[PDB]
Design a binder for this molecule. Structure first.
Ligand code: HEM
Ligand SMILES: FC(F)(F)c1ccc(N(c2cccnc2)C2CCN(c3ccc(C(F)(F)F)cn3)CC2)cc1
Length: 445
């Protein structure tokens, strides 16, 4: 009944925040290698951080209930972004209720409209920015613009898009997230909240006026508005109450924030690999898959006739996962294989680490869409168990739709010799900005 072997500190109360900041992959790999164990504890400012680095031991982290493993006290940082009483700020039972309303808005039933709506905004963006036949663009900043555009074309109603467009909304999103610093998640003890508040107090009033307007159309039942907002208004809790504007806006914000960073990074990655000359066989097999498709794609095409595309996307999330660390706070310990994690200990599971386990993924730095996890449950890019990703189906659909639409009508050339190196400065990891310069070439008669 002993604890994981603690990696020693040299500079004290720095813990490892410097060695970790530069390159998390190498650091964690070295820790795993030296300690001869996938399971080990590191110190971050004195805090006992315990990583579960053995892909065979994943279900230990993802299976327990919240009362045993609590995300809240480690994920608090998001409380100003979504507001109070929303998500973690709210108690677990009612957060579950909140998440149920959101998940019931991303049902495969809603997805029938999404495919044509995503294609519309991709082709709009390509008509206004891909204007020349040959041009240089930054892929990372462009896929983001496409992700926010198409996501608003899916879950935002006509009237809401007239009173808010995506391009202004993304400026509200960045206005809101800038209060996040990676080194504020382990210390329980704001110069940006002042700008964070004014963004929500702006969005909340805009939404409130759309609601005031929709209740004055509601008389006809002819308004027929069934978007993310439309369903969240109708939401009724277990105890008869309904969502207030504060809880409503927070939910919309969360819906967009979650998808926009993770999806755009995924898309960008996916495009850089296929674009690369070493990956030509994969680009061809992609083409073999999408060449037969009509100009206007339907739900079946993307979902049913596009497995290989999904193999590329998933591989991209397997190789370079957007979220490096998933975290919990232990309230009551349960055995982790042979070791045991004590109460008060901060337990983590790292998609960045696990996705690079030689047994699970031989040659982890190789992009290979046809490869299958050699250990069941190794791939945890969307998480697993109690807190698996509810946006997984939508993001997959979103990225695939974009890839199919882009490659069908364009060719791409990477100004670089090698695929961009990930940037670990940010908490959510994507490829380097100044490395993401790409040349586009339009396909002609
Ligand atoms: C590539 C795209 C995405 C990735 C990589 C991703 C990744 C993840 C991961 C790793 C988790 C687990 C969090 C944890 O256990 O600590 C998660 C949970 C979640 N994701 Fe995503 N996600 C993606 C897209 C989306 C989208 C589009 C949405 C919503 C639109 C979304 C909403 C959520 C939500 C609500 C959770 C709930 C976590 C919980 O149950 O407490 N995600 N996602
Ligand atoms: F809808 C929702 F319920 F409010 C919600 C939305 C997004 C998320 N997350 C999320 C983000 C991007 C894609 N998919 C899901 C996060 C919320 C907190 N989270 C993390 C993950 C890591 C870190 C840290 F410490 F590394 F910076 C901080 N927060 C992981 C899931 C969780 C809940």
């Amino acid at each position: 009944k002993k604890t994981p072997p603690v990696y020693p500190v040299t500079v004290p109360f720095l813990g490892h925040i410097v060695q970790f900041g530069k390159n998390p992959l190498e650091f964690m790999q070295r820790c795993k290698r030296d300690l001869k164990s996938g399971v080990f504890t590191i110190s971050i400012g004195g805090q006992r951080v315990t990583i579960v680095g053995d892909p065979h031991e994943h279900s230990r982290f993802f299976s327990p209930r919240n009362e045993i493993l609590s995300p809240r006290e480690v994920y608090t940082i998001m409380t100003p972004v979504f507001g109070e009483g929303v998500a973690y700020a709210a108690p677990y039972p009612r957060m579950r209720e909140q998440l149920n309303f959101l998940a019931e808005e991303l049902t495969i039933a809603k997805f029938q409209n999404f495919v044509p709506a995503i294609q519309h905004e991709v082709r709009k963006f390509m008509a206004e920015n891909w204007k020349e036949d040959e041009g240089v663009i930054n892929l990372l900043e462009d896929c983001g613009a496409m992700i926010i555009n198409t996501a608003c074309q899916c879950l935002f109603g006509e009237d809401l898009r007239k009173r808010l467009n995506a391009r202004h909304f993304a400026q509200l999103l960045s206005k809101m997230e800038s209060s996040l610093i990676p080194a504020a998640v382990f210390m329980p003890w704001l110069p940006q909240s002042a700008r964070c508040r004014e963004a929500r107090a702006e969005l909340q009033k805009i939404l409130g006026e759309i609601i005031v307007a929709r209740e004055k159309e509601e008389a006809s039942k002819d308004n027929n508005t069934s978007d993310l907002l439309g369903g969240l208004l109708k939401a009724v809790y277990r105890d008869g109450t309904r969502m207030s504007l504060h809880e409503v806006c927070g939910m919309i914000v969360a819906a967009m924030f979650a998808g926009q960073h993770t999806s755009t990074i995924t898309t960008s990655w996916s495009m850089l690999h296929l674009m690369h000359p070493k990956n030509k066989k994969w680009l061809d097999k992609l083409h073999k898959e999408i060449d037969e498709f009509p100009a206007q794609l339907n739900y079946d095409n993307v979902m049913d006739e596009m497995p290989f595309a999904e193999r590329c996307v998933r591989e991209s999330i397997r190789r370079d996962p957007p979220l490096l660390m998933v975290m919990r706070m232990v309230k009551a310990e349960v055995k982790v294989g042979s070791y045991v994690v004590p109460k008060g200990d901060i337990i983590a599971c790292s998609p960045l680490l696990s996705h690079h386990d030689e047994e699970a993924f031989p040659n982890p730095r190789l992009w290979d869409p046809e490869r299958d996890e050699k250990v069941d449950g190794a791939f945890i890019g969307f998480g697993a168990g109690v807190h698996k990703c509810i946006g997984q189906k939508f993001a997959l659909l979103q990225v695939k739709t974009i890839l199919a639409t882009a490659f069908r009508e364009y060719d791409f050339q990477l100004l670089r010799d090698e695929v961009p190196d990930p940037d670990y400065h940010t908490m959510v990891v994507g490829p380097t900005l100044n490395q993401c310069l790409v040349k586009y070439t339009r396909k002609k008669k």
